[PDB]
């Protein structure tokens, strides 16, 4: 009844020195299949810019800006985690509603599986550190 579930349960520190940055643990579930990808903010933002020019309705979504107080402060990172989570959830909400989308709700007896999502955007494909 609710075909695509997503959460961001935690964020992890990657890299060493000043090249160290945060990635977000994205847990995705479609039907009864779950997998997890690690994605930094930049990758979310590029995903949004890329997909917005292909599906105009996404422009009604507010993407979270990166915040000028303290990239060093984990409280900032935690707020960002919450916001990215809400964003992904709304992203799929819109993509389930929009008729010209490959994700649209009319495929939910048919062709919507891990595969539809993974192909829909390289953002959701299992790459290196990602896992199922």
Author numbering: 1181 to 1312
The authors write:
The Phox homology (PX) domain was first identified in the NADPH phagocyte oxidase complex subunits p40phox and p47phox, and has since been found in proteins in every eukaryotic species from yeast to human. Despite relatively low overall sequence homology, PX domains all possess the same core fold, consisting of three antiparallel β-strands (β1-β3), followed by three α-helices (α1–α3). An extended sequence traverses the protein between helices α1 and α2, termed the PPK loop as it generally contains a conserved ΨPxxPxK motif (Ψ = large aliphatic amino acids V, I, L, and M). Side chains of residues from the β3 strand, α1 helix and PPK loop together form a binding pocket for the headgroup of the canonical lipid PtdIns3P.
